[PDB]
Amino acid sequence: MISSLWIAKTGLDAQQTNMDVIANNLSKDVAIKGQGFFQVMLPDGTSAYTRDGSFQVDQNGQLVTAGGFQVQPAITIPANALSITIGRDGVVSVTQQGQAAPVQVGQLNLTTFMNDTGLESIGENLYIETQSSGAPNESTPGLNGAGLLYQVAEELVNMIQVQRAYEINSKAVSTTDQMLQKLTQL
Amino acid sequence: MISSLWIAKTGLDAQQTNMDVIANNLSKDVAIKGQGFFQVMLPDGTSAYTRDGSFQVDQNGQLVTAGGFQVQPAITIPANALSITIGRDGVVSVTQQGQAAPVQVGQLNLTTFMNDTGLESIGENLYIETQSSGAPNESTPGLNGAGLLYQVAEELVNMIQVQRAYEINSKAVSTTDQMLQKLTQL
Amino acid sequence: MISSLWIAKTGLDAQQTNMDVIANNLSKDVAIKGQGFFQVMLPDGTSAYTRDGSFQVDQNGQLVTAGGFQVQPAITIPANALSITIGRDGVVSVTQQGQAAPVQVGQLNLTTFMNDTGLESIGENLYIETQSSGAPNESTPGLNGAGLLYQVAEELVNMIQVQRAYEINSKAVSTTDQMLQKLTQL
Amino acid sequence: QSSGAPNESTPGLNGAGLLYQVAEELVNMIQVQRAYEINSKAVSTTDQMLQKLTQL
């Protein structure tokens, strides 16, 4: 019985989890068509990975975001000139004030892991490597492992049903307990 | 009387069991349309069987799951290339970076038992062979014994009624005992 | 009572089934005006039957579909020439690069069964012959048994009502049980 | 692999002809889209039914 309670409980817990997961579903912008993650570093120098393509050039040049974080390895962008572009391969090229158009101002690197499941979620769809994930393997878009850069309610349904399930589960448990109490004592 | 108590007891026990059973009822995904189980091995090398189709390719190639467990016998998957497919027969074919499309990278094997009842439940719908089950017989989907890969509340009702039953049972027992006590002594 | 429960249960089960069935209701394209099924074979060589007219010519000529499956018996199509046509009788004729217009490149065969009910559903409106169905009888469109090739919510209503029915059924059962419990003990 | 290898030729020869020199879908989509709406409706009722049933 207690076990049953546990059993019900566990299921109920799942149901909530499922629903929650269900809930969790339903300026330069670069997207990765296929597999791979962009590699990113914090001010500490720790490396992190993310599919999120949104970047802004901050005060410092280095590919800095809304926060200021730059990109690796040896390639920054601290000028005005004309514009800049990110090619399909990830090469960054620009037209500039210093009267030149550089190619490969820097080229973005991409990473892949043996198991994505292993990755530890920092939040904001940023992830960190773990023992389980395996080490990151680096490459560039359009070569080897990586493709080129390109340029829900059902869950809710689930969650509702799953959520419902626990409600059922509780119901069953209660009855028994009542039964027990009724039984106690015959 | 004690016997009756036992009798009631046994029934009551069943009732709980029934209810519990009642409770127990009500990324590549492959399903088995007909009979058969997928064959799976742990890190120890022990073999287990399961209908559950959910698999993920882990860091190692071998059909590894959320845990990392691979699949038998001689067929893994440690690359990126393009994609991969599992045919109806269980053959795994892929399109790859190593400029080739392999067929039968490996073919999944299926197992059947003389009596499924005999199988010992590990949990998570995974089962192990026993003396009672008989040895696993191996085959492939779409041949011989096995069909191709394809691509509740009533219990509650029962349980409630069954649960109720014991409550009745206890009631009967109590009365007698009371009767006995009343009888004691006349 | 238990029987009644069963009775209710059975009805309830049906109600769901009915609703479900209710749910289940509401490039060359060839349609069969009257009776008959197209005959089709898998890579294994097993024969299957379907009314579905949709076919595509795959890389191999043989009437291959989105999958590649061809058609029987002796008639393929592996060329470009101009076009191709399927006559009312099922004859396939083409205009071709090999400077000829063939007639009866091949002619499609149609099959009929003593009882369609017997047919076993593979899915995707494809069926396989069974003992119950009887053997397929072959013919061509426009001859004998077969006509020439040509060139719902109510269910929902039902389902809802039927679904409702079980709800009623359960209600009745519950009352009795309550009655019993009330009765127990008077 | 599925496509097969490309076979090459020139326009006007063999396999290739010379170089020369919708809403219905919408209709479909709307109806099809509608369909799921129906589908959901059916499901909900049953669940409600179940809940109503639970417990009788």
Numbering used by the authors:
A (entry chain A), B (entry chain A), C (entry chain A): 1 to 26, 92 to 216, 226 to 260
D (entry chain A): 196 to 216, 226 to 260
From the reporting publication:
The flagellum is made of three distinct parts: the basal body, which functions as a rotary motor as well as a protein export apparatus; the filament, a long helical propeller that propels cell locomotion in viscous environments; and the hook, which connects the filament to the motor as a universal joint to transmits motor torque to the propeller oriented off-axis of the motor. FlgF and FlgG are 26 and 29 kDa proteins, respectively, and together form the thicker, distal portion of the rod with about 20 nm in length and 13 nm in diameter. The rod is responsible for the stable high-speed rotation of the motor driving filament rotation up to around 300 Hz in S. enterica and E. coli and 1,700 Hz in Marine Vibrio15.
Here, we obtained a ∼7 Å resolution density map of the polyrod by cryoEM helical image analysis and built an atomic model of the distal FlgG rod by docking a homology model of a core fragment of FlgG into the density map and also by modelling the terminal helices. The atomic model of the rod clearly indicate that the rod is rigid because the D0 domains and the D1 domains are both highly packed in all the three main helical directions: the left-handed 5-start, the right-handed 6-start and the 11-start (protofilament) helix, in each of the inner and outer radial regions of the rod, respectively.
